[PDB]
Design a protein around this nucleic acid. Structure first.
Ligand SMILES: [Mg+2]
Ligand SMILES: [Mg+2]
Ligand SMILES: [Mg+2]
Ligand SMILES: [Mg+2]
Ligand SMILES: [Mg+2]
Ligand SMILES: [Mg+2]
Ligand SMILES: [Mg+2]
Ligand SMILES: [Mg+2]
Ligand SMILES: [Mg+2]
Ligand SMILES: [Mg+2]
Ligand SMILES: [Mg+2]
Ligand SMILES: [Mg+2]
Ligand SMILES: [Mg+2]
Ligand SMILES: [Mg+2]
Ligand SMILES: [Mg+2]
Ligand SMILES: [Mg+2]
Ligand SMILES: [Mg+2]
Ligand SMILES: [Mg+2]
Ligand SMILES: [Mg+2]
Ligand SMILES: [Mg+2]
Ligand SMILES: [Mg+2]
Ligand SMILES: [Mg+2]
Ligand SMILES: [Mg+2]
Ligand SMILES: [Mg+2]
Ligand SMILES: [Mg+2]
Ligand SMILES: [Mg+2]
Lengths: 203, 123, 123
RNA sequence: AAAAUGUUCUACA
RNA sequence: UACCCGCAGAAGAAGCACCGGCUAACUCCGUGCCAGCAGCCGCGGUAAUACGGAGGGUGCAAGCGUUAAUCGGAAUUACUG
RNA sequence: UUAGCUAGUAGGUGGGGUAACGGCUCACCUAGGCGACGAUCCCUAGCUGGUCUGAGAGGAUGACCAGCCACACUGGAACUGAGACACGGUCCAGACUCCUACGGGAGGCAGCAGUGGGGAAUAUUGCACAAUGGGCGCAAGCCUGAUGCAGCCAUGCCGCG
């Protein structure tokens, strides 16, 4: 469920390794009855190389697959892009994220009161501001930027919608930040699994 | 006869020097706390290294009042100042381990027998 | 250089500071691993060096190297640090003593054992 | 007249 | 008690560090910039006398290494200089 | 990268005080005294013989042993006394520990062992006053965790296997 294939800070060989490990995981999920779908996919200098990848899995068997793959993936291969480089231990990271959220229901609750900063007798006395509250959210707004109750109530509906939209936005943005931070917490050492050669020959 | 905003001295060694009653507990619209009464306090002054800290909101039992206590024969015992013993919010047991100055018999009850025992003198 | 100049202001000796200040001139210090992790050596080396962030009895919060192959250290492990910088890990000026208080000896090691806390194998 | 930058470790007593 | 005499029998009694240069002492195997070493210079990415084991060797030895600390080397506060 | 400090302060007279000189203290008078040859202030620290290192000059150091100093739960104070402002004396105050019949009392291992704690780390709740030394005593003798010894530890040096 929502893995993140990353080459951390490793070079184009780590990106190629991300592309090969993604294919290998495709093949394993298919033979193990799990479906794999790419969601976010960033590429390296070469089109066949993968800077990073975001993956959606499915099922209870998906958890077993994610447990077999999460961690550091080591690829033992001499560089195909740098002929006599010397380093041959490109390391990957695979880490599940579960960037999931629920669409809290439209259960807005309205309370219409007087307005702040009145300016006038009929205003001092009329109740035209509308304070809206999203139940099971914690979002309470107070719209008074109009002459009449009804316009404020409509603006309050739009503003509850907009504040839930932001809540979504900061939520997804914190997931963004977490996903990049994954790219900096990948220990290029103890491999969960090690593949060798130019054809990922073992597991 | 302690009410909200009243500053009490601290008859224990919890660390606080001055506390303020912010609520007289035990009844709607209750005005005053005498000796033996539990009040809510905020700590206004404390020693640098004590069990309690400045600004802490906790409980206290009033042990001395300048208003005094009446006895069944009509006698009254007054004190030069108002003083309380700090108590834990939940357990309502004293926080300090030492009671300073005298206390009175109105504390003689299972709630504050520890205070009574620790007190140097009980009027 | 002049004798008069030296009389007025003598040869000031170069004060030398310790490169193991957290030991406070102690051969070893006991500490608690606040965390155990791996890091990358600086150029031109490549590895996961195993280090522990350790809080010592004297309050210092330092990073220590965990030498030998394999270790059993986790958080809240109580270890000894002896000092001695690991050149290619910047900011790592102490070594964990293998075989001291929580840190195991290195498994199946046969030579330079005393350096790794390994008991003499019996045959 | 105008002319910017440059990838990486590099072997050999 | 020291000390002396008798008894039995080689019996009861050897480890630690190091071996690329500094610095005395080198090979094989495992490993493949991993694991690891390291005081410095630096080693390790398949032919590693530098990692880990073994054989051999070197130094010390009921001790041997490491860490800390002071002086030395440092004429690197220089009076000598 | 602390430059000014000082009013009993510096000196004098006199009185008092001390075992004794003395601003030691007091009264009065004078207006001085210290400071760049570092006063004052701040931080650190027991000092020495010595110890380690060093060719030496130096640098570092002051564990043990010996001389000196200071301290004796913290802060004060005096008493007794030849000698103390007194480790195992007194008085007071404070913190802490304890006893209490709640009125009030008790205590101080930085003596030797030992315990807990702290710590990387440092030992036995031993034997004996036989010796040396000390107190008291005419002496016998008593007392002496000084001391002599023993225990534990490769902690060091040396010797041996
Ligand atoms: Mg108007
Ligand atoms: Mg109206
Ligand atoms: Mg060795
Ligand atoms: Mg550019
Ligand atoms: Mg050689
Ligand atoms: Mg080695
Ligand atoms: Mg190679
Ligand atoms: Mg090889
Ligand atoms: Mg070598
Ligand atoms: Mg030196
Ligand atoms: Mg010199
Ligand atoms: Mg006189
Ligand atoms: Mg001191
Ligand atoms: Mg010299
Ligand atoms: Mg004490
Ligand atoms: Mg005292
Ligand atoms: Mg007298
Ligand atoms: Mg004295
Ligand atoms: Mg005593
Ligand atoms: Mg003792
Ligand atoms: Mg102990
Ligand atoms: Mg301890
Ligand atoms: Mg014992
Ligand atoms: Mg005797
Ligand atoms: Mg006796
Ligand atoms: Mg011995």
């Amino acid at each position: 469920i929502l893995l993140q294939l990353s080459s951390a800070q490793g070079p184009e060989e780590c990106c190629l390794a991300v592309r090969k490990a993604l294919d290998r995981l495709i093949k394993e999920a298919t033979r193990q009855d799990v479906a794999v779908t790419v969601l976010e996919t960033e590429t390296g200098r070469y089109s066949d190389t993968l800077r990073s990848a975001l993956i959606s899995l499915d099922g209870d068997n998906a958890w077993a697959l994610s447990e077999s793959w999460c961690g550091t993936i080591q690829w033992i291969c001499p560089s195909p892009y740098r002929p006599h480089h010397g380093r041959k231990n490109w390391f990957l990271g695979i880490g599940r994220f579960t960037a999931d959220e629920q669409e809290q229901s439209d259960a807005i609750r309205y309370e219409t009161l007087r307005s702040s900063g009145p300016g006038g007798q009929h205003v001092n006395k009329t109740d035209s501001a509308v304070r809206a509250t999203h139940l099971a959210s914690g979002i309470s707004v107070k719209v008074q930027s109009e002459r009449s109750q009804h316009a404020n109530k409509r603006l309050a509906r739009l503003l509850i919608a907009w504040k839930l939209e932001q809540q979504q936005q900061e939520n997804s943005a914190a997931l963004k930040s977490q996903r990049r931070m994954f790219h900096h917490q990948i220990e290029r050492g103890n491999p969960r699994r090690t593949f060798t050669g130019m054809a990922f020959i073992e597991g | 006869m302690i009410q909200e905003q009243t500053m009490l001295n601290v008859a224990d060694n919890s660390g606080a020097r001055r506390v303020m009653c912010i609520k007289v507990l035990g009844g709607s619209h209750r005005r005053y706390a005498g000796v033996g009464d539990i009040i809510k306090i905020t700590i206004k002054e404390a020693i640098p290294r004590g069990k309690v800290k400045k600004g802490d909101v906790l409980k206290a039992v009033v042990v001395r009042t300048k208003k005094g206590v009446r006895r069944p024969d009509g006698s009254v015992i007054r004190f030069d100042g108002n003083a309380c013993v700090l108590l834990n919010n939940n357990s309502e047991q004293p926080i300090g381990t030492r009671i300073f100055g005298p206390v009175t018999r109105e504390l003689r009850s299972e709630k504050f027998m520890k205070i009574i025992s620790l007190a140097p003198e009980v009027l | 250089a002049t004798v008069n100049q030296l009389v007025r202001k003598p040869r000031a000796r170069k004060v030398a500071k310790s490169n193991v200040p957290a030991l406070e001139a102690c051969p070893q210090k006991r500490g608690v691993c606040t965390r155990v992790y791996t890091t990358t050596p600086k150029k031109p080396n490549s590895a996961l060096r195993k280090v522990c962030r350790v809080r010592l009895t004297n309050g210092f919060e330092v990073t220590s190297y965990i030498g030998g192959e394999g270790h059993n250290l986790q958080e809240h492990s109580v270890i000894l640090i002896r000092g001695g910088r690991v050149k290619d890990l910047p900011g790592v000026r102490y070594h964990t003593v293998r075989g001291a208080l929580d840190c195991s000896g290195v498994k199946d090691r046969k030579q330079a054992r005393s350096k790794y806390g390994v008991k003499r194998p019996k045959a």
